[PDB]
Design a protein that fits this description.
part of a larger assembly, 8 chains, A alpha+beta, B mainly alpha, C alpha+beta, D mainly beta, G mainly alpha, H mainly alpha, A: 9 strands, D: 43% strand, binds a molecule of 8 linked components (NAG-NAG-BMA-MAN-MAN-MAN-MAN-MAN), binds 1-palmitoyl-2-linoleoyl-SN-glycero-3-phosphocholine, binds a molecule of 3 linked components (NAG-NAG-BMA), binds a molecule of 2 linked components (NAG-NAG), Dolichyl-diphosphooligosaccharide--protein glycosyltransferase subunit STT3 (chain E), protein-macromolecule adaptor activity (chain H), membrane (chain H), Dolichyl-diphosphooligosaccharide--protein glycosyltransferase subunit OST4 (chain H), Ost4p_sf (chain H)
Chain lengths: 149, 112, 258, 438, 196, 41, 85, 34
């Protein structure tokens, strides 16, 4: 499962370029009798187009009676838009091959979800000048009507 | 073949620097001094002052005229901060329909 | 003249500018042909809703308009390299086209074939425009002056080239076409050439899942790679034609294991 | 809820028919009561997997049949049968249960060629799950040509004796109570197409101004027959058409829609466009889909036609402005099984529903509104029924709606459109008596 | 306006803000919503999208009437409307099923040019602002708006070389350029392109 | 993609030879309105 | 009760329609001529010249008449083209 | 629904009524205007 870093899912808010997500997969082995938790290194997440954009090794950070989980940490999505697949191919010879993939769409920023003009330090000049032209325009129309020619 | 593989971290693009902030403060109050220079040039110093004010029964159409001219800038000023295009559009419809009648009886009342 | 303008302007509209682009009335008899909605509605009804259909670009909107599926190329040609991907895949052996059509997660590949009814806008005469735009990106992999018969002809029958016979779109479009009529002869109606079943080499990486009534729109599927890791042409040469209950035991000359 | 006592089965036949892509049983019981308080009820036991998929349940007397009050309830689950003329505590009675199911079986070779016969695998009981003791009970498996068992038992009894197009056997004496001792699996050839739809929504539209009723149906049909190996090839299909005569085989080429008597404006569309391969002859609407529906394939389409309203609607006697409509509950191909049906009838804009009666026990019913063309006010009255499990051949019924539609609300349609045209033209008058000239 | 469209160009997508002209879709969606909620009859969106070029064929005819009424008397405007209503050069790109983005283009070319000629005759500021609103709404629709921004300046410039300058020609052109060039810059397909 | 003359006669019936005579007749009383039609022609 | 409604159904008269569909497009054409003559002569009562109260009076009575003929006309012409009500 | 030959007759008769009343308007305008 993958979700946002603050807990929300892809379903409630779809993803976005330069976003904070978390990914979590859990493994389990079988000694013939019980499903025990699987201690392992070498497990690698891949965020992937045609070419891979992320290979992150998975730290455990979790436990259960019959499952040891693995996380990847909060990682930032690429600014490249597109349809990225989330892939774990655990392929180690000797023991069982597993593949988990989930294909998701990761979109550009909306027109609303930009740094705002009052927020940015550079656009205070132009907000002040547009506000100056507007207020001087209002005194221009009131002064123009109330004068006598 | 199978085994461990080197990591990839996707080195991001750099953002261009914004501005030094007190320079922007300096130009903000320079533009403030220019607009205040405009108003102080208008109201008394260049003698383009209020020669006539319609104090009769056509004053209410003049206040309606100021209600339209200030009203559309209040609507646009609300549109600058949030306030989606449809609520702005119905706002300037609900101002533009009574407001065009009281901003035309006024300009019928003044033939200059 | 004002009255003659009306009769001209209605005759020209009725004859030359009022025809559907979907129903194709070629009258192979005043017969209508809706093989495009038949095939695209097969994709809409009988495919999982996230399958990816890699067809040539000038049919890219209609698929997404009618099949409601995901394509790879499309009518506006804003990325020419991603169109040279599909153009490279359509004109290459299927060993090197399976490799490039699974690297992009493609499971369906459809082609247009107007050889049974004479459509002429099929994907075998706009096939050179798949080699021109993919030769300028990848030279010496896909190249023109192949697909020709060493005197400058563009042939389709048993006189044709070896690169033309082993191409992907050739053996995808002309599959089961000589077994159509009788006797092992097939008169291609557009190209006016007769092909034989000793032509059209078999297809070991793809398998057809749909073919329309007048054989216009063929829909193929990338069958999954083999479980025991061997290549699919070795599975194909395993399951047939080899070798008359005759064997040979030999040092396999395989090198060394890493 | 287990029944106590007071019924003992002397004779018990059980004839399963398997011949038209839904399982039908015709049980024939002859019961004896015990010396006690004379009780008047009966309990028929079904498994939990068969009780979920059952579409018809009825009872006869064998002497001369009238009907009986057969009620289906709502882990062996039961169905009650209520007798009139409460029975003396020692007297033989006779009885016939008929029942129609939804399941037909699994294709036992699930991949088979299109020119080859298919064989299906059905699973059932051999000893009958009766809530009471039986003294004699014979089984009869009527249906198609070839029947064969699956994992035959070692006992030479409880083994099938094949008859001419039949398969007769059964545990014949002294079965004590609820007996899940052995589950039968039988394979059998079955050359019907096995059409079944998943979601049928059918919308009808009563209209008092046009005096017409307008049917529109949306079918989502699958073919649950055996899937075909080596994919689909048009060469083998077209050669299979050109060889001979198109006998009985799996896939779907044509559908015969049995419509009401005088139907006028026939149409047949897909999602992407309309389909021109349809033939609307008198009383019969033949349909060819775009692709032949092989085993496991989907096809969602829409048909529609137009009847006059004078034979589906009837003015009541006490009030002139009270109408009673009886709607055909189901029209379709002759061999189909309906997994979901939602019947939306649409009364006009001022109609008010008084009484609702349905012959088939529905799953749901509700009354909403929906705005069609020139519904300026609230809109049409959408009375929608939800039926779950239906058979094309079995569920012969008509839905009876009793409503009113007074002439105060009959003329409010042209008066409402007149109200919009009038307020639009007075809006033109206000925008032309108004002075704006700076 | 913010639609990623992951169903096309599969690994890449198509942003459809800066690869689309959002003026045909919001017009036919305004007609669909308008006769949906305000007028009483709910018709399907496929019928709005098909019967769209026959609807604006007539508005092209009315706008050609008003344009030729600004060039000569109205009796030539009815000849021009009768010509362009049924002419085979426009019915080619205006067939009944044709939602191909020149169904809305010419019925804004003629309203744009009608308010331009009506703005340049009388020298009115208002007719040259509502020439610029239909110039903007012509930019929202079709990618051959460039023709207008090389024809209205070609007209005014030929008014300069002939010695026919006036205050009407100034007072029309300079507010056409002001409003029409601050306004056509808002379509995300056409960004700061009219600056550079 | 150049075009031949039967598309010009084909798309417009007799308007194709009133099209130049309209321009030549719009010169002979040349208002400021008609420069638009001449340049646009 | 399904049996009471079944008896009450099959002992009843059929639906006698108000206006049949085959005579109804003629009512649509004649109604279009009537409401087009009445509303076409209604915009000239406000059109030419008058006082205000007589222009309001004749405009509102002639717009009532032409409006109701317009609504009944588009009901019949709605039913004529294939859509119903 | 209307056929295609009947639509051809409808389109031509709208064209002929259109051009006819255009010519009538131009004659009445050109005769009786200063
Ligand atoms: C239109 O459609 C077109 C087709 O659909 C599309 O074109 C494709 O666009 C993508 C996106 O750019 C291309 O992918 C890139 O291709 C680069 C080409 O490199 C060539 O040359 C290299 C040698 O110089 C070869 O290594 C390379 O690959 C070869 O080897 C592979 C393995 O052996 C083999 O699979 C190949 O087939 C080939 O044989 C190729 O020949 C390629 O360099 C680039 O790789 C980087 O980026 C990937 C992620 O994007 C990483 O997975 C990969 O590991 C590389 O990462 C480097 O860059 C990242 C940031 O970009 C860093 O985060 C990494 O850490 C790493 O950085 C190292 O290197 C940097 C220098 O590059 C250095 O600065 C760092 O410090 C660090 O040292 C990627 O694969 C694709 O090739 C295009 N395909 C075609 C056919 O054109 C086009 O985009 C579409 N148009 C639009 C507008 O979208
Ligand atoms: C004297 C009276 C004066 C009245 C002035 C009124 C209008 C001035 C005339 C023209 C203005 C042009 C600028 C366009 C602004 C709207 C863009 C918008 O609406 O989209 C914006 C986003 O921009 C865009 O992506 C560009 C979209 C381009 C629109 C394309 C459609 C044009 C065709 C429409 C015609 C349809 C048929 C009608 C027939 C008549 C959504 O804004 P928002 O909802 O997030 O609001 C929040 C406001 N934040 C973000 C600033 C806080
Ligand atoms: C200032 C404002 C002035 C006031 C305006 C107020 C009112 C006027 C506006 C609308 C009045 C009526 C228009 C609705 C006609 C829909 C026809 C239709 O859509 O029919 C289409 C197809 O049509 C036809 O076959 C013939 C075409 C005839 C249409 C003529 C067009 C003239 C209408 C004006 C332009 C279009 C406007 C709407 C589209 C933007 C239905 O398609 P189908 O295949 O699904 O049906 C098939 C029938 N089965 C489902 C039963 C099978
Ligand atoms: C401005 C003055 C008036 C302008 C008049 C303009 C054009 C009229 C001339 C020809 C148009 C008729 C051609 C119809 C083509 C077949 C229809 C079809 O087949 O399409 C219909 C679309 O229904 C329509 O659009 C309605 C069109 C009605 C037009 C009748 C004339 C009224 C004009 C409006 C006047 C002003 C309105 C004021 C309101 C306050 C698709 O129905 P469906 O798919 O749901 O079928 C299933 C039907 N169930 C749902 C019942 C099962
Ligand atoms: C701006 C002005 C617009 C000018 C004209 C615009 C567009 C015309 C272009 C094409 C139209 C061709 C029609 C194609 C569809 C075929 C349907 C057909 O032909 O219906 C024909 C009959 O029709 C007619 O008798 C026409 C009746 C009279 C027309 C009245 C005009 C309508 C306007 C009224 C609005 C009044 C409100 C005033 C608001 C101010 C039958 O067909 P059916 O067998 O399918 O009916 C189904 C079978 N039953 C008969 C059982 C139902
Ligand atoms: C045509 O009608 C058929 C029949 O209703 C539709 O098929 C149904 O489609 C839905 C969604 O595609 C299927 O739901 C799916 O269920 C599976 C598990 O069974 C799950 O993995 C999916 O995520 C999804 O929830 C549904 O099973 C399927 N029904 C049958 C019987 O196959 C079909 O969608 C309709 N097609 C069109 C184009 O309208
Ligand atoms: C029975 O039908 C009613 C219809 O009134 C269903 O209630 C609606 O269910 C939908 C869920 O798809 C909700 O969105 C609506 O708000 C519900 N409406 C009302 C009035 O409750 C109900 O779910 C159906 N029940 C069953 C068991 O089928
Ligand atoms: C932690 O993991 C080990 C793995 O062997 C398991 O035995 C142990 O029970 C786990 N403890 C908890 C608290 O989950």
């Amino acid at each position: 499962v993958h979700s946002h870093a603050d807990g929300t899912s892809y379903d409630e808010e779809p993803y976005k370029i330069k976003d904070k997500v978390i990914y979590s997969v859990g493994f389990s082995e079988w000694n013939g009798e019980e499903w025990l938790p699987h201690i392992a290194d070498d497990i690698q997440f891949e965020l992937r187009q045609v070419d891979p954009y992320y290979r992150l090794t998975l730290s455990p950070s979790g436990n259960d009676s019959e499952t040891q989980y693995y996380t990847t940490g909060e990682f930032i999505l690429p600014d490249r838009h597109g349809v990225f697949t989330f892939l774990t191919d655990y392929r180690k010879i000797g023991l069982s091959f597993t593949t988990d993939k989930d294909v998701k769409a990761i979109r550009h920023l909306a027109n609303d979800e930009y740094p705002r003009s009052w927020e940015i330090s550079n656009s205070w000049v132009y907000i002040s000048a547009i506000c100056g032209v507007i207020v001087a325009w209002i005194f221009f129309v009131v002064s123009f009507v109330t004068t006598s020619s | 073949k199978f085994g461990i593989k080197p990591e990839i971290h996707h080195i991001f693009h750099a953002e261009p620097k914004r501005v030094a902030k007190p320079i922007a403060v300096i130009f903000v109050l320079i533009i403030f001094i220019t607009i205040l220079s405009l108003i102080v040039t208008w109201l008394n110093s260049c003698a383009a002052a209020f020669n006539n004010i319609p104090t009769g029964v056509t004053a209410v159409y003049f206040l309606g005229f100021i209600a339209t001219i200030v009203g559309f800038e209040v609507i646009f000023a609300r549109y600058y901060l949030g306030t989606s295009i449809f609520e702005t559009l119905f706002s300037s419809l609900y101002l533009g329909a009574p407001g065009l009648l009281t901003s035309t009886k006024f300009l019928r009342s003044f033939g200059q | 003249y004002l009255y003659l303008f009306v009769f001209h302007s209605t005759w020209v509209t009725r004859t030359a500018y009022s025809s559907p682009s979907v129903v194709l009335p070629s009258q192979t008899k005043l017969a209508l042909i809706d093989d495009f909605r038949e095939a695209y509605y097969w994709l809409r009804m009988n495919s999982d809703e996230d399958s990816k259909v890699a067809a040539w670009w000038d049919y890219g909107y209609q698929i997404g308009g009618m099949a409601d599926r995901t394509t790879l190329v499309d009518n506006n040609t804003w990325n020419n390299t991603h169109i040279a991907i599909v153009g490279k895949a359509m004109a290459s052996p299927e060993e090197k086209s399976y490799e490039i059509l699974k690297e992009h997660d493609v499971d369906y590949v459809l082609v247009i074939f107007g050889g049974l009814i004479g459509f002429g806008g099929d994907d075998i005469n706009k096939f050179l425009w798949m080699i021109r735009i993919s030769e300028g990106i990848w030279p010496e992999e896909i190249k023109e002056r192949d697909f020709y018969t060493a005197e400058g002809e563009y042939r389709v029958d048993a006189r044709a080239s070896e690169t033309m016979r082993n191409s992907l779109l050739y053996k995808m479009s002309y599959k089961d076409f000589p077994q159509l009529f009788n006797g092992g002869q097939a008169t291609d109606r557009v190209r006016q050439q007769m092909i034989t079943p000793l032509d059209v080499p078999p297809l070991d990486y793809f398998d057809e899942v749909f073919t329309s009534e007048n054989w216009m729109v063929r829909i193929y599927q990338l069958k999954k790679d083999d479980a025991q890791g061997r290549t699919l042409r070795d599975v194909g040469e395993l399951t047939r034609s080899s070798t008359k209950t005759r064997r040979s035991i030999k040092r396999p000359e395989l090198g060394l294991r890493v | 809820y287990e029944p106590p006592a007071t019924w003992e089965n002397v004779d018990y036949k059980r004839t399963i028919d398997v011949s038209n892509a839904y399982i039908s049983e015709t049980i024939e019981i002859t019961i004896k009561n015990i010396a006690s308080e004379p009780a008047t009820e009966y309990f028929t036991a079904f498994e939990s997997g068969i009780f979920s998929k059952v579409s018809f349940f009825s009872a006869y007397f064998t002497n001369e049949a009238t009907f009986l009050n057969s009620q289906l309830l709502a882990e062996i689950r039961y169905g009650i049968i209520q007798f009139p003329n409460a029975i003396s505590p020692q007297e033989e009675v006779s009885l016939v249960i008929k029942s129609f199911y939804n399941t037909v079986g699994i294709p036992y070779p699930e991949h088979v060629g299109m020119s080859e016969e298919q064989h299906l695998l059905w699973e059932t009981n051999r000893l009958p799950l009766s809530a009471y003791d039986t003294k004699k009970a014979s089984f009869t498996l009527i249906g198609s040509s070839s029947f064969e068992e699956y994992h035959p038992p070692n006992d030479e009894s409880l083994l099938g004796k094949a008859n001419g197009n039949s398969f007769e056997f059964g545990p014949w004496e002294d079965i004590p109570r609820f007996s899940s001792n052995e589950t039968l699996a039988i394979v059998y050839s079955h050359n019907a197409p096995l059409n079944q739809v998943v979601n049928l929504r059918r919308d009808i539209w009563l209209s008092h101004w046009a005096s017409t009723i307008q049917f529109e149906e949306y079918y989502e049909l699958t073919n649950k027959a055996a899937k075909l190996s080596k994919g689909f090839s048009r060469l083998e299909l077209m050669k299979q058409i050109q060889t001979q005569n198109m006998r009985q085989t799996h896939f779907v080429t044509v559908l015969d829609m049995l419509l009401p008597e005088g139907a006028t404006d026939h149409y047949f569309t897909d999602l992407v466009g309309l389909v021109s391969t349809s033939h609307a002859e008198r009383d019969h609407f033949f349909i060819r889909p775009r692709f032949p529906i092989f085993g496991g394939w989907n096809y969602n389409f829409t048909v529609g036609w137009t009847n006059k309203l004078s034979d589906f609607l009837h003015v009541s006697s006490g009030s002139d402005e009270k109408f009673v409509a009886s709607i055909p509950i189901l029209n379709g191909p002759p061999d189909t099984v309906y997994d979901n049906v939602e019947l939306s009838v649409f009364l006009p804009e001022g109609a008010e529903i008084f009484d609702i009666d349905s012959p088939v026990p529905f799953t749901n019913v509700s009354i909403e509104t929906q705005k069609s063309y020139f519904d300026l006010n609230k809109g049409h009255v959408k009375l929608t029924f939800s039926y779950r499990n239906l058979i094309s051949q079995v569920a012969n019924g008509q839905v009876l709606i009793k409503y009113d539609y007074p002439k105060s609300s009959f003329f409010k349609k042209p008066l409402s459109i007149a109200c919009y045209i009038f307020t639009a033209l007075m809006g033109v008058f206000v925008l032309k008596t108004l002075n704006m000239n700076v | 306006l913010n639609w990623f469209d992951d169903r096309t160009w599969y690994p890449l997508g198509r942003v459809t803000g800066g690869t689309l002209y959002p003026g045909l879709m919001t017009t036919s969606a305004f007609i669909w919503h308008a006769l949906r909620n305000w007028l009483g009859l709910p018709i399907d969106i496929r019928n709005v999208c098909v019967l769209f070029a026959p609807l604006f064929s007539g508005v092209t005819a009315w706008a050609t009437y008003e344009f030729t009424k600004e060039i000569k008397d109205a009796s030539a405007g009815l000849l021009a409307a009768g010509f362009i209503a049924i002419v085979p050069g426009y019915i080619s790109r205006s067939v009944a099923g044709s939602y191909d983005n020149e169904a809305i283009a010419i019925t804004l070319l003629m309203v744009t040019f009608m308010f331009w000629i009506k703005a340049q005759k009388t020298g009115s500021i208002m007719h040259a602002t509502c020439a610029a609103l239909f110039y903007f709404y012509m930019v929202s629709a079709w990618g051959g708006y460039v023709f207008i921004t090389n024809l209205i300046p070609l007209h005014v410039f030929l008014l300069i070389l002939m010695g026919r300058y006036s205050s009407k020609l100034y007072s029309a052109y300079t507010t056409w350029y002001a409003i029409g060039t601050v306004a056509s810059m808002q379509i995300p397909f056409v960004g700061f392109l009219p600056i550079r | 993609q150049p075009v031949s003359w039967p598309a010009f006669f084909f798309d417009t019936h007799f308007l194709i030879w009133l099209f130049p005579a309209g321009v030549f007749l719009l010169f002979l009383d040349l208002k400021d309105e008609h420069v638009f039609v001449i340049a646009y022609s | 009760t399904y049996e009471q409604l079944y008896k009450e159904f099959h002992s009843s008269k059929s639906f006698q329609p108000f206006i049949h569909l085959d005579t109804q497009p003629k009512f649509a054409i004649c109604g279009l001529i009537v409401t087009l003559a009445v509303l076409s002569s209604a915009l000239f009562a406000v059109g030419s010249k008058s006082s205000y109260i007589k222009k309001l009076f004749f405009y509102t009575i002639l717009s009532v008449i032409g409006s109701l003929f317009a609504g009944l006309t588009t009901v019949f012409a709605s039913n004529s083209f294939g859509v119903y009500v | 629904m209307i056929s295609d030959e009947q639509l051809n007759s409808l389109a031509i008769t709208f064209g002929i009524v259109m051009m006819t009343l255009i010519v009538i308007y131009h004659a009445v305008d050109s005769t009786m205007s200063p």
